Amino acid sequence: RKSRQPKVVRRCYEAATCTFPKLAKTDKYTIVRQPLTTESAMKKIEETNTLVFLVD
C-alpha cells in the first residue's frame, strides 16, 4: 500500500517558495480573552495568589 503523495498541493500555504505561510487560527490572544475584576475575583488575588480570566 502506497502512502498518498498527491501530485500537486491542495491549498497554497504549503508549497515550494510560498514565503507567506499561514497565520495561526488560535493565537495566545484568542485563548485568553480578558481578566475578571469583580468583588469575588479580587478577593482571591490578595490571599490565595490566584488570577481569574475569561477564556475561549
Partner RNA sequence: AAAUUUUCAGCAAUGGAUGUCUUGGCUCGCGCAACGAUGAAGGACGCAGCGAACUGCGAAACGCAAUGUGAAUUGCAGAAUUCAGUGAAUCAUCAGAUUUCUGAACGCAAAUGGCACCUUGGGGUAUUCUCCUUGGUACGUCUGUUUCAGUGUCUUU
Interaction of residue 25 with RNA, rule CB under 7 A: yes
What the block records as the C-alpha cell of 31 is: 485563548
Query: Where do we find the cell 501530485?
Result: 7
Neighbours of 55 (CB within 10 A): 8
- Give the nearest distance from C-beta 9 to RNA in angstroms: 10
Site size with RNA, rule: CB under 7 A: 12
Judged by DSSP in three states, 53 sits in strand
Interaction of residue 22 with RNA, rule CB under 7 A: yes
Residues near RNA (CB under 7 A) = 2-4, 10-11, 14, 22, 24-26, 30, 56
